[PDB]
Amino acid sequence: MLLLRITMLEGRSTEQKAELARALSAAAAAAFDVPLAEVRLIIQEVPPTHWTVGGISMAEL
Amino acid sequence: MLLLRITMLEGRSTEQKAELARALSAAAAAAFDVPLAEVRLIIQEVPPTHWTVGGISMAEL
Amino acid sequence: MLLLRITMLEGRSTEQKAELARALSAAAAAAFDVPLAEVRLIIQEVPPTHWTVGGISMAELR
Amino acid sequence: PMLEVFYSGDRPPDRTRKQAFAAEASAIFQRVIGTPPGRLQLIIQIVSPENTLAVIDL
Amino acid sequence: PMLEVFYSGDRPPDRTRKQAFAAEASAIFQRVIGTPPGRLQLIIQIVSPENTLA
Amino acid sequence: PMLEVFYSGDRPPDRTRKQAFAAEASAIFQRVIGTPPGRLQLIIQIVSPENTLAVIDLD
Structure with missing residues (x-):
């Protein structure tokens, strides 16, 4: 077995996601x-x- | 404690998801x-x- | 490193999610x-x- | 598909219990969604009681 | 609700620190969203330095 | 971003191999999405074969 799982913020390109993988x-x-x-x-x-991070959301700001 | 977590490709029927659970x-x-x-x-x-799988998404078929 | 991850049911307010965090x-x-x-x-x-839980979805209320 | 199991109790399961569960899980995925054996990615994690809520009163 | 915790650092935390944390986590879930005590699924994972960016 | 790695096999990697992997993962994130060095939350888990499907026919 080798499995990877990424957890990331929304808003990256289709193309960037495919590069990471x-x-x-x-x-x-x-x-x-x-x-x-x-x-x-x-x-x-x-x-x-x-x-x-530090208790406050990335939405700040 | 006993907790199960399934991670699966979407597209299956609600009857299938329920029968797996x-x-x-x-x-x-x-x-x-x-x-x-x-x-x-x-x-x-x-x-x-x-x-x-092997670097390439399932939408690749 | 210190990382927390919460998995929970849809439906809480954003003020609740933020107080939790x-x-x-x-x-x-x-x-x-x-x-x-x-x-x-x-x-x-x-x-x-x-x-x-117990094999039965929460949507069964009831 | 992936299946993660988190187990915590007085007594961690021996190899026999895990074998049984592995084979039932594969057969279920195969019968319900067609998953060939064994493409299922199974991961059983045995969590020590001091690492759960139970740590409060052991 | 489920709460996974991943900790990596110089010394792993003793029982006392995990006790304080499990108690506060329960009370916090109870106060903010009503989850009855005992129903939080808590999983602490002590991850060793070699298994992280450290 | 967080990266979880689950590995199971007869020959798991030594520390030095994992830290080459960690450095490379870090650089991949910084190259593709601009993650600054030091921010990737990385967890490698070595999963025992007995805790995967291979437990069916161990010998």
């Missing part, structure tokens, strides 16, 4: 020593309001 | 010897563009 | 002695059909 998947295949074809990756997106 | 909860109660009443299960859906 | 972050910083400014918290919501 391609580069992260190759990096993981190579390092953990697993065929690339077995690597799963899941993206989960979050509104600015549901990511907080 | 029901069958997997009963299976976990029996296997791990916890009362069925204590078993929680969360279902989390993902678009085809957000599930990748 | 504020109070749990401050509680984590103090209990675990880490500076408040390093604490992150993520909220995930799910619909009532996707939270199940």
Whole structure:
């Protein structure tokens, strides 16, 4: 098994999301020593309001 | 505690999602010897563009 | 690192979500002695059909 | 699909219980949504009681 | 509701700190959204330095 | 952003391999979405085979 799960803020390009998954998947295949074809990756997106730092939301500001 | 979390590609019927929640909860109660009443299960859906294998999304087909 | 993630049912107000994020972050910083400014918290919501107890969805009320 | 299990109790399950649950889970995903065996990504996490709410009164 | 906590640092927290935290987390969920005591699904994960950006 | 990694296998990676991975993940995020160095919340979990599907036929 090798599975990756990204949790990120909304509002990135389609193209950027596809780059993360391609580069992260190759990096993981190579390092953990697993065929690339077995690597799963899941993206989960979050509104600015549901990511907080120091208790206050990214929506600030 | 006994909590299950499914992460799955969207597109399945509400009857399928319900039958997975029901069958997997009963299976976990029996296997791990916890009362069925204590078993929680969360279902989390993902678009085809957000599930990748070997670096490439499921919308790639 | 100190990161929190909440998974909970859809339906709460935004003032509730924010009070949760504020109070749990401050509680984590103090209990675990880490500076408040390093604490992150993520909220995930799910619909009532996707939270199940005893195999039965919350939408069964009743 | 992915399935994460979080278990906490006096007594962590032996290998037999996990085998049973693994095979039931695969068969269920196969029968309900057609998932070939074993494409299911299964992850069982055994959480120590002091790492749950139960830490308050052990 | 579920609350996952990921902690990494120099010394892992003793029982006392986790007690204080579980108690405050319950009371906080209880006060803000009504979740009855005992129903919060809390999972603390102590992650070792080698397994993080550190 | 947060990255969770779940690995299970007969030959897990040593510290040094994981830290090469961590540095590379960090740089990927900074290259693609501008994440500043040091901000990626990264969790690697080494999952025992007995806690995955492979537990079916261990020998």
